[PDB]
Design a binder for these strands. Structure first.
Length: 52
DNA sequence: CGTCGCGACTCAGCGACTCTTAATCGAAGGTTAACACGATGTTTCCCGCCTGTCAAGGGGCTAAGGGC
């Protein structure tokens, strides 16, 4: 369904054991947006999972 | 007697091939300037050569009947 999503990572793709909390808003028709974090504790706008 | 001028260093990071094994039924939707000679094939009959009938004629071979 269209709307913002916050998929907290379950440890996978983490530095050691930390979570990611990828805040992604899925539009009904358009380009996806990802506001996930990293091990450096920084929010990166991974638009449509292309770049970070 | 300190650092920094100047060097590697491994750490991260970024890209990327497969989804068993047989099977349940066959195809599958759009895109919308106008015209002109020329050289280039396309398609029809038309005679040329030749092929394939059956027949006609005949003879030559084979065989069957009659006579001594």
């Amino acid at each position: 369904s269209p709307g913002v999503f916050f998929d907290h990572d379950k440890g996978k793709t983490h530095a050691s054991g930390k979570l990611l909390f990828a805040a992604r808003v899925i539009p009904y028709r358009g380009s996806w947006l990802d506001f996930e974090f990293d091990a450096k504790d920084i929010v990166y706008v991974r638009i449509d999972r292309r770049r970070k």
